[PDB]
Amino acid sequence: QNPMRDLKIEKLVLNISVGESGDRLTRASKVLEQLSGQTPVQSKARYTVRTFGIRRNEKIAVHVTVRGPKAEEILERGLKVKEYQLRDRNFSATGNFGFGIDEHIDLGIKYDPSIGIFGMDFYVVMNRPGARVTRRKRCKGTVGNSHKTTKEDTVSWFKQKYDADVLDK
């Protein structure tokens, strides 16, 4: 049965992978600030590569997580840019989904040649109610199979509202 099990969106997490720190990265932070409204979070390189031109702990890529209605907007507003067509991939067998778009200008958000042009990673975490059981302190449990988000259940949820397309096979 299906009373309380519906489907909420847990969170949407945008992320910008840039191959360095400094000006180019603090700009990618400005992009996500005025887009999220919440201040974003920087990430440091995990090790050193030198073909990717990075030293460990270098400050590579900012990102942010957004929850609730505010995520529905940046979902749809970016979903538009994809013309509401994903692939049979893009959906994890564990139930979430994500895509990516170059040129943040292509959803809202004017240009500013002092801020440049950046591409993004949109990723969207789906969970039914009572997902707290996994995340709380006391009595931390796991969600039963007849609750856990599947790929099927999410694609069928996606092909419905938003009226988008799955494509591929």
């Binding site: 067998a93 302190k137 006391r138 009595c139 931390k140 449990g141 199979n145």
Partner: protein, 296 residues
Amino acid sequence: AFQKDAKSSAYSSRFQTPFRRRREGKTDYYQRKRLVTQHKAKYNTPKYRLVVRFTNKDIICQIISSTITGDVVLAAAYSHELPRYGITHGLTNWAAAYATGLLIARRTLQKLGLDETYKGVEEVEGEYELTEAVEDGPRPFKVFLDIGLQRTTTGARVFGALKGASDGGLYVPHSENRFPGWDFETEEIDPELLRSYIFGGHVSQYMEELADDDEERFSELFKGYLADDIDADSLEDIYTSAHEAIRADPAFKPTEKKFTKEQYAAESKKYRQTKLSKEERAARVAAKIAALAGQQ
């Protein structure tokens, strides 16, 4: 689950399971050991915790000692006993937590005999105090807060219960800095605020600020405050009389109870599946290998 996930014999065999109350996310043993253990030169002297727990909107207060067989409840007070004392709603909140502690404080200290000596503070101006040792007479009852897995944040209601047990006359060693009105940026306690929380004036001010700025929400939540004709201003005297009510007769009314234990056993055992016999289970296999196997 997922095919290439899950688990082998090897894995499951050599797996050492945690304790029960750790597999249940109920008990923090690292802190349990450090709360329970007694100085080995005090021998059988019990070390009594104050267990303060919060269900969804019921408050448990137990003064508890330990034994290798189990624990031992000296006295216990639940915040759902507050109706007896004049609190019918919002018995979860900070000032509900306070009173429940004061209930547990008066309750034990009574059945101990330290009732008339060691009354604690009747005033409740909210100044910082712990109950002092009465000269040439029994030292106070000593009890240590068992917070459980509750997170320690400044203002949290787990320390509300502390304040009521401490103001009730128990000796419960505590610092100030986790009470609301603890100034972060100076070590200073605004008491005019802490009184506001002991009497509920943070909830009363929600009522008032939701009187003229919206009534859609003020009726949704704060519903019952209408239906009994209680609007904010009286909230202070409600609790102020509950304190009087508690110190007057703490003695713990048990429920009248209606239907003997044997009764509850009967009806509830209807709804409980019972196990099987190997003979019954052997017949279930023999059935399967009849049908499923032999080509219909």
